[PDB]
Structures are given as C-alpha cells and as structure tokens.
C-alpha cells in the first residue's frame, strides 16, 4: 500500500503483512542456540523449558 496521489506533497503509507512460515532449525554442540532456515540466529537452547 502507498498513499493516494496529492500534488507537491509528501505522504506516508503503512503496510502490515502478517507472515507465518515453516522453517528447518539447526543447532550444534553444546546446543545452547539454534539458527533458522532464514539465517536468523536464536540465542536460546532448543530444549529450554520449565
């Protein structure tokens, strides 16, 4: 989404697209953190819990 056309004026148009994906996570010893298929690091052990 972009703002409608108004002459000699700046306009701001916000777009929010919810996205959900199934990614393959990987982890290595000591398994204290894991990465995702998108290359994002997650600094939490995959087995962390209560």
């Amino acid at each position: 989404y972009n703002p409608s056309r108004v002459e000699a004026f700046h306009r701001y148009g916000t777009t929010v697209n919810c996205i959900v994906e199934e990614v393959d996570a990987r982890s290595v010893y000591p398994y204290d953190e894991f990465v995702l298929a998108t290359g994002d690091f997650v600094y939490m052990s995959p087995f962390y819990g209560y």
């Binding site: 953190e33 990465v35 290359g39």
Partner: protein, 50 residues
C-alpha cells in the same frame, strides 16, 4: 672315550635363512584435518552472522 664335539664337524645341509615380516603399526595421518580446511576460508557465514 671322546666327546662328540672333539671331532671337526662340517654342515652337510644347505642353510636357508627365513626372516618373517615384522609387524607394522599404521598411525593416523592427514595433510589437512577437516577443521583446517574449514578454517582455510577467509570468512565464515556462520560466525559472521552469529
């Protein structure tokens, strides 16, 4: 009576010396370990992203 070793003895047999093959132990040897090959790269995407 005289001993058996008092007379000169000549070997009537055609000696054949047989030297068995000595046991050999093979130790591990690698020109470049898998860790060295990984370290050969100037940059590592895993460490840089982390």
């Amino acid at each position: 009576q005289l001993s058996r070793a008092d007379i000169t003895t000549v070997s009537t047999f055609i000696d054949l010396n047989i030297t068995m093959l000595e046991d050999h132990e093979f130790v591990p040897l690698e020109v470049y370990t898998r860790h060295e090959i990984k370290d050969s790269g100037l940059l590592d995407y895993t460490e840089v992203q982390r």
